[PDB]
Amino acid sequence: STIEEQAKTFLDKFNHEAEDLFYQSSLASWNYNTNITEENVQNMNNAGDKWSAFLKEQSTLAQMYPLQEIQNLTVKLQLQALQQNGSSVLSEDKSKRLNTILNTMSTIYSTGKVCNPDNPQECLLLEPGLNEIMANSLDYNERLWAWESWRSEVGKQLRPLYEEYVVLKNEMARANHYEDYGDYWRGDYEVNGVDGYDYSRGQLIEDVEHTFEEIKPLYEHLHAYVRAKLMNAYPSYISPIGCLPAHLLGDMWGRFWTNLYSLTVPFGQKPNIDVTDAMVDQAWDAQRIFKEAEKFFVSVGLPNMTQGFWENSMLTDPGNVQKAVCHPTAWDLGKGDFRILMCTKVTMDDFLTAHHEMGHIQYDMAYAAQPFLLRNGANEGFHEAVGEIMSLSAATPKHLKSIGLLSPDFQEDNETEINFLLKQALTIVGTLPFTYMLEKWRWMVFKGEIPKDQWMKKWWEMKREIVGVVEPVPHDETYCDPASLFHVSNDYSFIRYYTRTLYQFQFQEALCQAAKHEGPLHKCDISNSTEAGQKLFNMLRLGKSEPWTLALENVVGAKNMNVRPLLNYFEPLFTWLKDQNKNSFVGWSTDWSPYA
C-alpha cells in the first residue's frame, strides 16, 4: 500500500467514527440547550470529553501520513485539517485549568443577576430582566442602573478569570507557533500555497483597518444625527459635541443601535416599515414566521426544510418549567438531521432572524455531501454573511408588501426609502465601529500592548476614540467591561461580525445582478429568482473544499473584502445625513463625559 492508499483508508475510518460520535455529542448538546438540567449538563460534559479525546487521538494518527506524499487534494485537505494540534499542546493540568476557567466564566455570565438596591429580594437577570430595560427604558437613571449594575456585579467577578485566561490562551497559541492568541484567532482567514489566492494572518488587520477608513465618514454622520435625536429624548444628558452615553444605545452594550429607530425615525408620518404591529394585528406566530422563511428559500430554487426540521426543531420558549438557552442557533447534527433553536417572539427582529438562521441551515444542507471536516463554511464570516443576505432581501419594503405586512395600496417614495435605509444603518452600520473596536482591544491585549493596570483605561479610551461612545460612570481595573458581553467571556472570536458585513453586500450585489435587478442595491429582493439561488448554491455546496478567497471570487469576482457595495447600499442615506447635519457638529470630543 502507498502512503495515499493508507491515508484514504484512514480517512474513511475517521469519517465514519466522526459522524457517529458527532451525532451523539450533538444530541446531548441539544438536550442541554433545550432542557437545562444537571443531568443534561453531565451528559454534555462527558460527550465533550469523548469528542476532544477522539479528535486528539485521530489527529495523532493523521500525523503519520506526510502531506508532501499526498497527491489527492481532497485527501490532502482533510489531512491538513486533522493535523492541527490545537489546545492539545497544553499539559493535562494546565488544559484542565483553562477548561475550568472557561466553564466558570460561562456560568458566571449565564447565572449573573443583579438586585434592586431597595427591596433586594427580587432580582433581574440579563435575559430577560436587564435586556428589556436596556431595549425599552426611556429613563436615564434606570438604564444607567442596569448598565452599571451588570458591569459591576458580573464584570468584576470575571476580571481575575479573564486575566488568567489571557495567560493560558497565549501559552497555547505560542506553543502552536502563533505570535499570540489573537494571531491564532486570525488564522481562520489564512490561505497557503494556492498560487496567488493565498492570504496571510497579518493581512487581515491591514484589510480591516483599510476598509474601516472608508466606513468612518458614514458612521460619523449617522452618529451626529443619532446624537441630535437622542438629545430630544434625554434632555440635559447629551452634549452636542460629545460621545454618546453607553447606556442609551438600545441594548446592554450598544452592539446594535436597532432599538433607537423609534427615537430616530426620520419620517414618522409614512407607514411603518417596522412590521411588528402588522404581524401582531394579523396574529402571526412562530410557525407562520418560519413557514414564510421556508417559502422564501423555495422561491429561489432551494429545498424546503426536511420533515425532521419541523418535527425536532424548537421554535418557541418551552415555558417556566424548563429553562432553555434562547440564543438563536441553526443545528447541523449530521445524518440528515437539521434543527433550529429559537425562542421566537412576534417581532420584526425575530422575522429577520428566522430568515438568517434558515440561511445557516440552507448553507449546511448544501454542503452535507462533503467529507466531515469540509462540512463547514468557507470562513467564520461566510455563514453569518449567508444569513445576512437573506435578511437583506427580507427587510425590503417591496418584500414586506408581497407577503402582506404592508398594505397592498402602499407606495415607495424617497421618505420611506430614507426610513428603510436609516433603520438598516442602525443595525448594520452601527455595529461596525463597535465590533472593530472590541476585537482590536482583544488583539492588543493578547499581543501584550495593553498592560493590566491600563486595561479598562485603554478600552474606554478606544471606545471614545473609535466608537464615539463614553462611559457614564468612571471604571477602574476592578471592572472587566468587555467580559460583560457573551462573546468575550465565552471565548468567541468577534471580527467575523465585521467581515460578514462586507461579504454580505458583495454577495447581495452579485446575486442581484444574477436576478437582473434594476435600481439601487437597497431596493433589491431576490425572491422568485431561481437564477440568484443557483448562483449562491454553487458556492454553498462547496463547503470549505476551496479557500475563502476563491469561493468569494466565484460569486462576486473579488479575492478580498470590498467595502464599495456597502457604501453604495447606504449612499442615499449618506447624502441625506450630510444635509441633515449641515448645522450640527459632526465628530466628537474624547474629553466630554457625563460624570465630568
Binding site: 466522526a18 458527532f22 455529542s25 450533538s26 448538546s29 442541554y32 440547550n33 460527550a47 465533550g48 469528542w51 476532544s52 479528535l55 485521530q58 489527529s59 485539517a81 486533522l82 492541527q84 490545537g86 472557561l102 466553564n103 466564566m105 460561562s106 438557552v325 440564543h327 442557533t329 466531515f372 471536516l373 462540512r375 463547514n376 465565552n490 471565548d491 468567541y492
Partner: peptide, 13 residues
Amino acid sequence: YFQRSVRLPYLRC
C-alpha cells in the same frame, strides 16, 4: 455547542 473542527471542537453554550 459541538463543532466539526479539530482546532475548535467545543464552543461554550
